[model samples]
Target: QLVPGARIANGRYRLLIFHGGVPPLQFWQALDTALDRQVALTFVDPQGVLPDDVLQETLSRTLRLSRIDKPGVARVLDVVHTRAGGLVVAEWIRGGSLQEVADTSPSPVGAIRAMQSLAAAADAAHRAGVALSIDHPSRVRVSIDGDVVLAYPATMPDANPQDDIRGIGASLYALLVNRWPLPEAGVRSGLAPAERDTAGQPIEPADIDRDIPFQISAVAARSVQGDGGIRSASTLLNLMQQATAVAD
Candidate 1:
């Protein structure tokens, strides 16, 4: 909800700063007055969508992130937008992308678990019927301190309900095998894309490491390749929970 008397009229963009929350202790607000140095921020091509009010060309839902800023999740700075586009400005966190985290994880399960938490955050957005289209490995933030902060789901006009859930499966596959299980052509995410059969289905990825247990592999496979692949984020979360709990 826009704070009363805190909105800037059109023809300009303003930086907003605050130190407070719901059930506040001491609320303080700051607006960009061109007085201080540049704030720590980033510009992204807006991530996903929100429910009810479908905002366009704006930053992630600030109020939403504010309501749910847990340790293993990303945070939105504010709702900034370009003149005629939905480019976003968010807080810049020092961390590696999901791919980088996978590349250097001490164990495959570590990376997969990180993805699980990230998926849950994305799922929350999905429950709101919001867009969670920002599923690329690079957009995922795995902080050096080991916290995972996913990009906020801003607005995706043609986004599908199952898009983010299926993406969780593919992302889990990447964490385990370091590959995008099913490449969506025309989309770019830097990591090596998965191979597809002539029928245009995602081919089974070769088991590159022997350490990934079968149970874990089964969970990942069912997620990405099974005929009855997990469709809901909550279900996918359950599968991962079981996969991570099984003994090697």
Candidate 2:
């Protein structure tokens, strides 16, 4: 029954556009009348009927994520819980999905640049013991200035640092080849799956796209497989820096 122009959070937020979300959550672009700014609003319980404990726990985790201060990460603004449901307000991101970026088939350097901020943000979040669950293409967007930003601020309760590392690699691979390298992300984003070899392993980005630099391709492939000791976001960030330097 949620509709555009409908007001929520004590009439502070006026829903504008509906963005897709997984169950128990609905994403929206809303006008924050009190602040006179656009904000991303997440409905923690779209059905307006979740148990109170579940809502409270979700709010607690969200509050923890709100403490992450990073450029590419969406900043959490406010969290409201009502009998209707729980709501999380975050800074609005102005750009298209990473899936859209992949569709454009950006250059290898552009792809690396696009993911740099996100990799940094993920590293910071992991340092604080939180996971951003950025593996899905739909969870991130390429901003007007070409930085990839997390479109949502919520942390996945079950996700760990390794999942985020794989996500970073998968995202970079997607941007380079226009194909999502992880089956999980492909299912979530409906992006084209990366071609696989006879052993059922995804082909390296350079193998799929001749123009992709070898350094970038190797990093993406190894990270996706959690190979080469690419187990930490900081390690992934370091690899990204080295790849960027080599590619440049």
Give the clashing pairs for model 2.
Answer: none
- Largest lDDT belongs to which candidate? 2
Instruction: State every prediction's TM-score relative to the real structure.
Output: 0.66, 0.88
Q: On a 0 to 1 TM-score scale, where does candidate 1 land against the true structure?
A: 0.66
Q: Enumerate residue pairs that collide in model 1.
A: 48-153, 48-154, 48-155, 49-131, 49-154, 49-155, 57-86, 73-149, 74-149
Tens digit per residue, CA lDDT, model 1, 40-134: 22323313233324543223343444455454345555554543223333444466555665565346567556666766776676666554554
Clashes of each: 9, 0
lDDT per residue as tens, model 2, 122-220: 888878877876656777777888888878666646557788888788899888887777775223575788899887889999887788888899889
Off by over 4 Å in 1: 1-67, 70-73, 184-188, 197-206
**RMSD after Cα superposition, model 1:** 9.3
Q: In lDDT terms, how accurate is model 2?
A: 0.78
RMSD (Å) per prediction: 9.3, 2.4
